[PDB]
Ligand binder design. Structure first.
Ligand code: SAM
Ligand code: SAM
Ligand code: PBL
Lengths: 200, 200
C-alpha cells in the first residue's frame, strides 16, 4: 500500500463552498484537489493500492479528516471541480452528524469517509497499524535511495506543516526524505514519489 | 530552455467554454489546464525557462495553437479554472482576427499568444530553430540514460499523438523517451521530466 497524509492548514471545513473560488474563499482547496487527483489517477484506471488522508484546519469547524480509499472510489474524475464536489459532499455528511458519530469514519460516497481527527492522532493511528512514516522537506536522503516499506508519506501545504508539528515527527523518528532540489507544489511531490516506487 | 508541445485532439477551439464542464463539452480542457499548471508553477514562483505550446484540434475551428511563455506570464494561477479563463480569452482573441492576422503570434494576455498553426508545422519551426525533439512515450529509452539538450518535449493527450503524427516524428528522428513502466497522465509526465532535468 502507498499512503499519504496532507495537512491543509486553511482549507474550508464547511460544505458552503464557492466552486468558482477554490483557491481563495475555500482556503486553497484547489491544491488539495490536485493532490487527490495526482495520488490516484493513471491513464486507464485508478491506483487501487493508494489511501489518501486530508486533514483540514480551516474555518469554521476544524479539524476534519477525509480518507480516500483508492480500491473503493467511484464516480471521481481527475479534474478539480469534480473532486471539490466530492469533498463538499463529505463535508455535508460531516455536518449531518453529532460529535459522538464524528468519532468514526463516516462514509459519504464510495471510498470517501469523513471523521473528526487531527494530524498527530492520525499519525499515531498509522504507527499503531505498523506503518513507517516518511516526511518531506529539504535535508533528507532522496526517496530513490531509501528502503521504503509499508509507507505513509507526509505532504505539507503551501505554508507547510509548521514548527510545532515538525518536531513531533522528529520525536517519533519519522524518516526525512527529499525529492528535488527545488521547492515543489505538494501535488508534484506525490507524482515523483509514485514514479520512484513504480520504477522499483 | 525547456519547451513542450501538447497535442489536444478534442479541446474546443472557440471561446464558448463551459467552466462547469471542462472535461466534457470543452473536450478535456481540464487536462490541458493541468499540463499548463504543471509545466510552470513552483511553490514560490514560475519556471521562467519554460515555453509551452498547446495545439487544439477540437471543433469548431481547428487548429488553434496557444503559446505560453513562462518568462512573460502574469496573473495566471495554478488552478484549472483560472487557466481555463486565460485559454478562453486567447480563443476570444483568435475569434477577433482575420485569417491573415492568424498567421502571426497574437498576444492575448501577458505571455499568452494565439496563432493558426498545426502540430507538424510547429515541430518543423522548432527543428528550424535548432531544437532537439523528444517524444515522451512509454516504450522509449529510459530517460535517465538519454543526453537531453535544447529540448522540445512532445506530450500526447489521453488518446495520444496518433499514427499520422507518430509517422512524422519518426521520420524527423524524434528521440523516444520513457519516464515510467506505467502509462501516466500527460501532466504527470511533465512533472517527471522537470524533476529529471532539475536533478541534472
Ligand atoms: S511547499 C511548503 C509544500 C509542501 O510540498 C513538499 N515539498 C515542496 N518541495 C519539496 C522538495 N523539494 N522536497 C521534498 N518535499 C517538498 C513539502 O512537504 C511542503 O510542505
Ligand atoms: S498517455 C496517451 C498521455 C501522454 O503522456 C505521455 N506518457 C504517458 N506515459 C508515459 C511514460 N511512461 N513515459 C513517457 N511518456 C509517457 C505520452 O506523451 C502520452 O502521449
Ligand atoms: C491524409 C492522407 O492523404 O491519407 C495522408 C497520405 C500520406 O496521403 O496517406
Amino acid at each position: 500500500m502507498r499512503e499519504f497524509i496532507f495537512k491543509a492548514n486553511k482549507t474550508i471545513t464547511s460544505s458552503d463552498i464557492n466552486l468558482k473560488d477554490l483557491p481563495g474563499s475555500c482556503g486553497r482547496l484547489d491544491l488539495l484537489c490536485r493532490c487527490v487527483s495526482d495520488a490516484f489517477f493513471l491513464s486507464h484506471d485508478i491506483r487501487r493500492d493508494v489511501v489518501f488522508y486530508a486533514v483540514l484546519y480551516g474555518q469554521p469547524n476544524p479539524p476534519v479528516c477525509i480518507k480516500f480509499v483508492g480500491s473503493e472510489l467511484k464516480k471521481v474524475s481527475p479534474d478539480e471541480r469534480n473532486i471539490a464536489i466530492f469533498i463538499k459532499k463529505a463535508l455535508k455528511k460531516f455536518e449531518e452528524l453529532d460529535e459522538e458519530q464524528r468519532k468514526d469514519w463516516n462514509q459519504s460516497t464510495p471510498g470517501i469517509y469523513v471523521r473528526r481527527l487531527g494530524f498527530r492522532n492520525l499519525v499515531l493511528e498509522k504507527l499503531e497499524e505498523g506503518k513507517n512514516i516518511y516526511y518531506l522537506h529539504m535535508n533528507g536522503e532522496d526517496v530513490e535511495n531509501v528502503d521504503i516499506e509499508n509507507p505513509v508519506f507526509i505532504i505539507g501545504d503551501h505554508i507547510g506543516i509548521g514548527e510545532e508539528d515538525e518536531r513531533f515527527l522528529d520525536e517519533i523518528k519519522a524518516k526525512r526524505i527529499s525529492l528535488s532540489p527545488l521547492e515543489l507544489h505538494a501535488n508534484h511531490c506525490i507524482t515523483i514519489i509514485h514514479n520512484v516506487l513504480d520504477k522499483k
